[PDB]
Amino acid sequence: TLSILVAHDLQRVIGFENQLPWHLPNDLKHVKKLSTGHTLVMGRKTFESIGKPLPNRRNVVLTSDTSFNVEGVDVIHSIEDIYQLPGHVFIFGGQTLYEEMIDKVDDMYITVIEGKFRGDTFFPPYTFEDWEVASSVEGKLDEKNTIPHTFLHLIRK
Numbered sequence: 760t761l762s763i764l765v766a767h768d769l770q771r772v773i774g775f776e777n778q779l780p781w782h783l784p785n786d787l788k789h790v791k792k793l794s795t796g797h798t799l800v801m802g803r804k805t806f807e808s809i810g811k812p813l814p815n816r817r818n819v820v821l822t823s824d825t826s827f828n829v830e831g832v833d834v835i836h837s838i839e840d841i842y843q844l845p846g847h848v849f850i851f852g853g854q855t856l857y858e859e860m861i862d863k864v865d866d867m868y869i870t871v872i873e874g875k876f877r878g879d880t881f882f883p884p885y886t887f888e889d890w891e892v893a894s895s896v897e898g899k900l901d902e903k904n905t906i907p908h909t910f911l912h913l914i915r916k
């Protein structure tokens with residue numbers, strides 16, 4: 760099973776200066792709950808923006824660097840290698856990996872951030888004519904989660 764996992768804004772910004780433009784604990788809980796016990800595939804820059812694997816799932820970094828080695832991270836050097844990973848595999852960023860994979864994934868788990876942020880990286884455009892809305896759940900606003908947001912599960916038609 761091949762899924763996208765992404766948070767994107769009203770204009771499909773996903774990032775700014777190798778960071779997320781927003782901080783939204785609800786989305787981080789969402790990510791952890793979806794991906795615990797499973798597999799995260801991410802591009803090198805996305806991984807390096809964090810510096811350490813997320814516990815309790817397989818962390819897989821795609822890079823052309825043959826010297827790349829981090830404790831608790833598995834490395835792949837080709838897109839083709841993704842299709843050999845067992846279980847539920849989540850494409851986890853960044854822009855380059857989304858662009859490479861969006862036509863290949865079965866479904867997408869998208870947090871729509873209902874804001875317009877300054878960004879330098881983007882999710883690829885897509886149309887709902889290719890995707891069914893399996894579910895659409897509004898996130899609760901509070902003092903810790905102050906941007907409106909929607910959890911979408913889309914499945915390729």
Ligand SMILES: NC(=O)C1=CN([C@@H]2O[C@H](COP(=O)(O)OP(=O)(O)OC[C@H]3O[C@@H](n4cnc5c(N)ncnc54)[C@H](OP(=O)(O)O)[C@@H]3O)[C@@H](O)[C@H]2O)C=CC1
Binds near residue numbers: 822
């Ligand atoms: N809003 C969100 O849900 C998320 C946002 N982000 C954001 O995205 C941004 C980073 O995105 P982006 O700049 O596109 O970088 P990526 O994280 O996608 O990394 C790009 C790198 O991935 C490696 N790579 C990609 N494709 C291949 C391939 N086919 N073969 C071998 N290696 C490959 C290369 O590594 P190398 O150069 O070492 O060869 C490449 O330079 C940051 O702003 C981050 O915060 C990231 C995830 C989620």
Ligand SMILES: COc1cc(-c2c(C)cccc2C)cc([C@H](C)C#Cc2c(C)nc(N)nc2N)c1
Binds near residue numbers: 766787790811818869
């Ligand atoms: C192990 O490498 C990473 C770890 C984290 C990370 C998480 C998910 C929770 C707590 C702490 C950390 C460091 C994040 C990322 C990237 C930036 C991403 C992402 C992302 C987010 C935030 N939301 C939705 N919906 N999709 C996403 N792909 C990479």
